[PDB]
Amino acid sequence: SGFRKMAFPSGKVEGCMVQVTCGTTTLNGLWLDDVVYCPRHVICTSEDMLNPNYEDLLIRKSNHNFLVQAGNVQLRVIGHSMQNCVLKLKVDTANPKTPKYKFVRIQPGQTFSVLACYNGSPSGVYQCAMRPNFTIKGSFLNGSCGSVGFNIDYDCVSFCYMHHMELPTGVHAGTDLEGNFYGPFVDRQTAQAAGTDTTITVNVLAWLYAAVINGDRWFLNRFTTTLNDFNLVAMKYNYEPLTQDHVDILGPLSAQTGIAVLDMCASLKELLQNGMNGRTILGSALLEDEFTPFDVVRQCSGVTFQ
Amino acid sequence: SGFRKMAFPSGKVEGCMVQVTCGTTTLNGLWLDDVVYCPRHVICTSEDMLNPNYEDLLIRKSNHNFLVQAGNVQLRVIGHSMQNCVLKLKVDTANPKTPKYKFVRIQPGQTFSVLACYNGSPSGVYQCAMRPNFTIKGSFLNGSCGSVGFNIDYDCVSFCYMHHMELPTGVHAGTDLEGNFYGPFVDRQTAQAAGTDTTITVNVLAWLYAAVINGDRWFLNRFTTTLNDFNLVAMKYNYEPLTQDHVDILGPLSAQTGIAVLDMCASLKELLQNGMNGRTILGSALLEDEFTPFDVVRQCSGVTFQ
Ligand SMILES: O=C(c1cc(=O)[nH]c(=O)[nH]1)N1CCN(c2ccc(Cl)c(Cl)c2)CC1
Ligand SMILES: O=C(c1cc(=O)[nH]c(=O)[nH]1)N1CCN(c2ccc(Cl)c(Cl)c2)CC1
């Protein structure tokens, strides 16, 4: 038993991280096959940041302007191209450690592991969720651009995020691996603001189920409610509305514990209106929303990867 | 910026995990050089558990009774010996992925990363602390015995824990890599109880400093206190007393923020006596004690490993 904010083993990704330098700027890159992916803002200087024209900036660059380092080994950049907000540097050597992978663009509410890097060197790994406002609450210091977020399905590493910048409020914004930003953000150093964030209802529910699985039942009751009655209350507290798709997804957890989704919703309804009264659930004094129903199953059933 | 419960990259450890089978029992093992380490309780059966005589049990075993699997490859056990509570299986092949490592026995209050495994396959990684009562609040399911805890210093993996069992209260107990249990526990399936747990004062302080570094200052005040006056209060709330060694260790963080340790202690004193009043620090409604002063520096300064 037990319940921790578990990240995926980072081994397969560690071998793909490299250092990319362009002029005075150095950040991280992702080496898969013979291509290195990194944020395109690596080609900007102090003056270009406020409002860069990446097309002009890139055309004024030659392959030799890009220094790519894989530990001690230097990679030769034999070509370069831009795909949206990421730069793709063709190198002469194919990464022999390239795992089976794919690129996926995730939806808000989904979670993934982040491998924070600096100078192409992995510093740590942590779990987090894509907030409804398309930002993530990460932990990044100067030099972390290029760090990636991923998930693991059996033997395939699914990359879903590349780190680009930090917003004034301290939250982070980035893109998928095809260079499309998550959210209404652009890679310019202009002051940008994220929309208002909401709580991920379906995740809080999955977490209450984990609590029940781990012996914490104090918040349960005999009542029930309807999807309509619940949503009315949820919206008053900045919670995402709950859909029928959410209800089905929570099925496996409902079966395992024998508590119907709508029953659990009525308990959540009470928690929102009456607070926790100095009580805790799974060691927390707040309702947690960064665990998806799948994360709960995984940790309460023990699924492994190859 | 940002502050997350960061674990170390697990890559170097992933390559050392193997599956160990003895009869009907299968658990995880750690393969370093030509030796595989695993809990010695892998040689017990249903009847031996209540009160096993490991000496007799081991002498009745032959090398061929131990099946060691490294993925698809089977390892030949050419010898075996017992060192306290761990079994050491000499194999014919030396792990080519053996990293630079060492074994260290940690003190309560220190943190480390746990790589949870099942059938020799890494499932996830998470950070945790050795509680003052010699248990850890982990997340382990059946088949997790043999999973290890470690830290990373530059390029050296320091192993400090091997998972052995779960206590009735849901917390976990294990040994160092030399087989000595942490705490007054023994590898028998008899009902055992951990002593009362206390809060790690020095860690809560390091965490308040992280909060200050991240813009959360609401809990600060102008007051100060003396180590003596603080401890008097701390003990009334089940907090470890604070020593002068703790004060010096917190030095780097004090300098960086410009807030004296004893000033921070007076703020903590207030928090214990007046509660947080529905406020949060770094996203938490409770005082967190699983971040050491070193973990805070690392994450608020960005140290990497090779
Ligand atoms: O390394 C960090 C960083 C990342 C982070 O998450 N937190 C933090 O403190 N620093 N930066 C800040 C963003 N910068 C940047 C340069 C040009 C453009 Cl055009 C844009 Cl959009 C951004 C690169 C360096
Ligand atoms: O795999 C788990 C396990 C670990 C955990 O942390 N949580 C959980 O639910 N299961 N076990 C429980 C402990 N068991 C055991 C056998 C013989 C002896 Cl002599 C002792 Cl001491 C222990 C081995 C299998």
Tab-separated table of N, CA, C and O in Angstrom, chain B residues 92-142:
chain	number	residue	atom	x	y	z
B	92	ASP	N	27.833	-15.804	-12.834
B	92	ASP	CA	28.972	-15.986	-13.730
B	92	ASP	C	29.303	-14.752	-14.562
B	92	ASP	O	30.450	-14.556	-14.971
B	93	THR	N	28.293	-13.930	-14.819
B	93	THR	CA	28.463	-12.723	-15.614
B	93	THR	C	28.471	-11.455	-14.771
B	93	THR	O	27.637	-11.279	-13.882
B	94	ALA	N	29.392	-10.552	-15.093
B	94	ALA	CA	29.478	-9.271	-14.404
B	94	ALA	C	28.614	-8.271	-15.173
B	94	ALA	O	28.696	-8.191	-16.402
B	95	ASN	N	27.769	-7.530	-14.457
B	95	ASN	CA	26.881	-6.560	-15.094
B	95	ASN	C	27.704	-5.514	-15.833
B	95	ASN	O	28.457	-4.758	-15.228
B	96	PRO	N	27.564	-5.454	-17.160
B	96	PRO	CA	28.334	-4.459	-17.910
B	96	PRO	C	27.842	-3.026	-17.675
B	96	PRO	O	28.548	-2.058	-17.971
B	97	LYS	N	26.632	-2.904	-17.133
B	97	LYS	CA	26.034	-1.599	-16.846
B	97	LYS	C	26.269	-1.131	-15.419
B	97	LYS	O	25.680	-0.148	-14.986
B	98	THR	N	27.125	-1.828	-14.687
B	98	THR	CA	27.405	-1.444	-13.311
B	98	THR	C	27.954	-0.020	-13.250
B	98	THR	O	29.011	0.267	-13.812
B	99	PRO	N	27.253	0.888	-12.551
B	99	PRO	CA	27.729	2.266	-12.424
B	99	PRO	C	28.756	2.374	-11.314
B	99	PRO	O	28.977	1.419	-10.572
B	100	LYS	N	29.313	3.567	-11.142
B	100	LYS	CA	30.225	3.810	-10.045
B	100	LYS	C	29.282	3.886	-8.847
B	100	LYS	O	28.303	4.635	-8.883
B	101	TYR	N	29.530	3.089	-7.812
B	101	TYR	CA	28.626	3.088	-6.662
B	101	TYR	C	29.304	2.853	-5.314
B	101	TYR	O	30.497	2.541	-5.232
B	102	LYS	N	28.491	2.936	-4.266
B	102	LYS	CA	28.930	2.669	-2.925
B	102	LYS	C	27.717	2.447	-2.050
B	102	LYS	O	26.601	2.827	-2.416
B	103	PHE	N	27.930	1.819	-0.897
B	103	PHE	CA	26.841	1.547	0.026
B	103	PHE	C	27.000	2.463	1.222
B	103	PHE	O	28.085	2.554	1.795
B	104	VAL	N	25.917	3.136	1.606
B	104	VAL	CA	25.949	4.035	2.745
B	104	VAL	C	24.735	3.775	3.613
B	104	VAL	O	23.642	3.549	3.104
B	105	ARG	N	24.915	3.835	4.922
B	105	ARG	CA	23.798	3.649	5.832
B	105	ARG	C	23.398	5.056	6.233
B	105	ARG	O	24.214	5.811	6.752
B	106	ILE	N	22.162	5.437	5.935
B	106	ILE	CA	21.710	6.792	6.236
B	106	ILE	C	21.140	6.978	7.629
B	106	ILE	O	20.850	6.008	8.330
B	107	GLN	N	20.984	8.247	8.012
B	107	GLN	CA	20.450	8.627	9.312
B	107	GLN	C	19.018	9.090	9.126
B	107	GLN	O	18.638	9.553	8.046
B	108	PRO	N	18.205	9.001	10.183
B	108	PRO	CA	16.835	9.483	9.992
B	108	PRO	C	16.831	10.955	9.598
B	108	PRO	O	17.684	11.730	10.033
B	109	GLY	N	15.873	11.326	8.762
B	109	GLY	CA	15.767	12.693	8.313
B	109	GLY	C	16.305	12.889	6.916
B	109	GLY	O	15.942	13.849	6.242
B	110	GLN	N	17.167	11.979	6.477
B	110	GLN	CA	17.751	12.051	5.144
B	110	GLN	C	16.783	11.506	4.114
B	110	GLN	O	15.948	10.657	4.417
B	111	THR	N	16.883	12.019	2.899
B	111	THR	CA	16.003	11.601	1.836
B	111	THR	C	16.740	10.829	0.769
B	111	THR	O	17.969	10.911	0.647
B	112	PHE	N	15.965	10.090	-0.010
B	112	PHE	CA	16.500	9.297	-1.094
B	112	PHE	C	15.390	8.958	-2.085
B	112	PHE	O	14.204	9.104	-1.789
B	113	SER	N	15.789	8.507	-3.263
B	113	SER	CA	14.853	8.134	-4.299
B	113	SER	C	14.654	6.634	-4.269
B	113	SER	O	15.593	5.873	-4.053
B	114	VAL	N	13.420	6.221	-4.506
B	114	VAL	CA	13.065	4.814	-4.538
B	114	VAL	C	12.626	4.446	-5.942
B	114	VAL	O	11.749	5.083	-6.530
B	115	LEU	N	13.202	3.373	-6.452
B	115	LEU	CA	12.831	2.876	-7.753
B	115	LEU	C	11.973	1.638	-7.504
B	115	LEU	O	12.508	0.550	-7.269
B	116	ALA	N	10.652	1.789	-7.537
B	116	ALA	CA	9.778	0.648	-7.301
B	116	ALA	C	9.830	-0.301	-8.494
B	116	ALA	O	9.680	0.132	-9.639
B	117	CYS	N	10.046	-1.586	-8.213
B	117	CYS	CA	10.123	-2.618	-9.247
B	117	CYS	C	9.205	-3.799	-8.960
B	117	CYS	O	8.766	-4.008	-7.831
B	118	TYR	N	8.961	-4.582	-10.008
B	118	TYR	CA	8.146	-5.789	-9.949
B	118	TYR	C	8.667	-6.720	-11.018
B	118	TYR	O	8.789	-6.324	-12.177
B	119	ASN	N	8.992	-7.948	-10.622
B	119	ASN	CA	9.519	-8.946	-11.552
B	119	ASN	C	10.768	-8.435	-12.252
B	119	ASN	O	10.999	-8.710	-13.427
B	120	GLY	N	11.580	-7.689	-11.514
B	120	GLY	CA	12.810	-7.163	-12.083
B	120	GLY	C	12.609	-6.009	-13.038
B	120	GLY	O	13.568	-5.539	-13.654
B	121	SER	N	11.368	-5.554	-13.180
B	121	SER	CA	11.069	-4.461	-14.094
B	121	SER	C	10.661	-3.151	-13.389
B	121	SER	O	9.675	-3.123	-12.648
B	122	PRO	N	11.417	-2.052	-13.615
B	122	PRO	CA	11.121	-0.750	-12.995
B	122	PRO	C	9.760	-0.198	-13.387
B	122	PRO	O	9.456	-0.043	-14.569
B	123	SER	N	8.954	0.095	-12.370
B	123	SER	CA	7.605	0.630	-12.544
B	123	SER	C	7.526	2.150	-12.354
B	123	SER	O	6.750	2.829	-13.032
B	124	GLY	N	8.290	2.679	-11.406
B	124	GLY	CA	8.227	4.109	-11.143
B	124	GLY	C	9.298	4.550	-10.174
B	124	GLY	O	9.961	3.714	-9.557
B	125	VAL	N	9.442	5.860	-10.005
B	125	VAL	CA	10.416	6.417	-9.068
B	125	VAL	C	9.795	7.521	-8.235
B	125	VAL	O	8.984	8.308	-8.721
B	126	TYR	N	10.158	7.580	-6.965
B	126	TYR	CA	9.596	8.609	-6.102
B	126	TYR	C	10.553	8.948	-4.970
B	126	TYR	O	11.439	8.156	-4.643
B	127	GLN	N	10.410	10.154	-4.430
B	127	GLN	CA	11.288	10.646	-3.365
B	127	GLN	C	10.631	10.383	-2.014
B	127	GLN	O	9.407	10.430	-1.899
B	128	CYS	N	11.434	10.140	-0.982
B	128	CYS	CA	10.891	9.934	0.361
B	128	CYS	C	11.985	10.105	1.406
B	128	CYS	O	13.169	10.193	1.074
B	129	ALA	N	11.585	10.177	2.669
B	129	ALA	CA	12.546	10.350	3.758
B	129	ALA	C	12.500	9.211	4.768
B	129	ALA	O	11.461	8.590	5.000
B	130	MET	N	13.633	8.986	5.412
B	130	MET	CA	13.719	7.986	6.449
B	130	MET	C	13.133	8.696	7.659
B	130	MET	O	13.672	9.701	8.102
B	131	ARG	N	12.018	8.195	8.175
B	131	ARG	CA	11.389	8.821	9.321
B	131	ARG	C	12.214	8.567	10.584
B	131	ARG	O	12.932	7.576	10.676
B	132	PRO	N	12.096	9.457	11.586
B	132	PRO	CA	12.784	9.321	12.873
B	132	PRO	C	12.537	7.941	13.492
B	132	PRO	O	13.346	7.468	14.281
B	133	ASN	N	11.426	7.292	13.127
B	133	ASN	CA	11.134	5.961	13.644
B	133	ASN	C	11.658	4.808	12.760
B	133	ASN	O	11.287	3.651	12.956
B	134	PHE	N	12.558	5.114	11.830
B	134	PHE	CA	13.174	4.104	10.990
B	134	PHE	C	12.263	3.371	10.006
B	134	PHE	O	12.574	2.269	9.567
B	135	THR	N	11.179	4.022	9.602
B	135	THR	CA	10.275	3.467	8.596
B	135	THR	C	10.219	4.520	7.495
B	135	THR	O	10.614	5.670	7.707
B	136	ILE	N	9.665	4.152	6.348
B	136	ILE	CA	9.477	5.111	5.276
B	136	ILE	C	8.020	4.979	4.846
B	136	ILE	O	7.436	3.903	4.953
B	137	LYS	N	7.448	6.076	4.360
B	137	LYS	CA	6.064	6.092	3.887
B	137	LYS	C	6.174	5.901	2.377
B	137	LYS	O	6.281	6.853	1.607
B	138	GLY	N	6.211	4.644	1.967
B	138	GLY	CA	6.392	4.359	0.566
B	138	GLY	C	5.125	3.975	-0.163
B	138	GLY	O	4.010	4.118	0.345
B	139	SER	N	5.310	3.445	-1.362
B	139	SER	CA	4.198	2.983	-2.167
B	139	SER	C	4.698	1.718	-2.834
B	139	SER	O	5.462	1.766	-3.806
B	140	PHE	N	4.314	0.591	-2.244
B	140	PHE	CA	4.748	-0.722	-2.692
B	140	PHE	C	3.583	-1.705	-2.672
B	140	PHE	O	2.780	-1.716	-1.735
B	141	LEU	N	3.528	-2.554	-3.690
B	141	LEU	CA	2.503	-3.586	-3.794
B	141	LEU	C	3.225	-4.919	-3.721
B	141	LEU	O	4.456	-4.953	-3.731
B	142	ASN	N	2.472	-6.011	-3.670
B	142	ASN	CA	3.064	-7.354	-3.630
B	142	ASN	C	4.075	-7.491	-4.762
B	142	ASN	O	3.810	-7.074	-5.888
